Ligand binder design. Structure first.
Ligand SMILES: O=C1Cc2cc(Nc3cc(Cl)ncc3Cl)ccc2N1
Ligand SMILES: O=C1Cc2cc(Nc3cc(Cl)ncc3Cl)ccc2N1
Ligand SMILES: [Cl-]
Ligand SMILES: [Cl-]
Lengths: 4, 122, 122, 4
């Protein structure tokens, strides 16, 4: 999971 | 403020390809000369300008069989259908001309671009 | 010896979401309490262990309406349906419990994992 | 396009  | 799962789109496409290999929820047959290819209308539309136009048509959206132009090569279609479901293009010296012609007909602009680049190099 | 188009899976999912927003080729309604959500069976199956089981069932595969357990919160479902079609999860303090419970029921293991991680941190 |  990432910060888009 | 959403978070994103990097592998989600790839995992979705991998599962759609698994459904295709097991012939689950396929709703159309694409006829190319004597050859028949089962697929999901939504995936075809998502990948191809031609299928997008066909399946948004109020009459054609309801057809279970679609016949392609007799000039379309079954192998070129097969390579492109595999690319739609995997992101992988089996581009070879012996098939590049048939793949480019089929991609132009199917309106798959990124495949057309790589075929034109690979031909120019040789 | 294939070549790969990096953005293909993401572009496919983006087009499937565009079809969803325009209600094109949607073939199922998911009922959550009073709320109704239109979707593509194949996308639901590709994202959820629960929908995978439902739509591979020889009787349920043919249903146009699926009613979820009355404990399922419509907002939690909506957030998860958006994630299925975009890879983006709108996880917030006020919805995390409903999102985790809905993801456990839908069998979306990667969402369950991030919810458990975010809860543990607080 | 890449070599996968
Ligand atoms: O090279 C290409 C690939 C492609 C895909 C689609 N399919 C869609 C496009 C839009 Cl905007 N919404 C929904 C869909 Cl399914 C249309 C044209 C082209 N050209
Ligand atoms: O967390 C999850 C997400 C998920 C998706 C699917 N869907 C498939 C799985 C296979 Cl192997 N082939 C085809 C499909 Cl559509 C099943 C279980 C789970 N669990
Ligand atoms: Cl393309
Ligand atoms: Cl997930």
């Amino acid at each position: 999971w990432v910060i888009p | 403020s959403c978070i994103q799962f990097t592998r989600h789109a790839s995992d979705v496409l991998l599962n759609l390809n698994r459904l295709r290999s097991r012939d689950i929820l396929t709703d159309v047959v694409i006829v190319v000369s004597r050859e028949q290819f089962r697929a999901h209308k939504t995936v075809l539309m998502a990948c191809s300008g031609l299928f997008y136009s066909i399946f948004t048509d109020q009459l054609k959206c309801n057809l279970s069989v679609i016949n392609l132009d007799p000039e379309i090569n079954p192998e070129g279609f097969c390579i492109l259908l595999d690319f739609m479901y995997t992101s992988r293009l089996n581009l070879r010296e012996g098939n590049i001309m048939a793949v480019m012609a089929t991609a132009m007909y199917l309106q798959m602009e990124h495949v057309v671009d790589t075929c034109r680049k690979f031909i120019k190099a040789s």
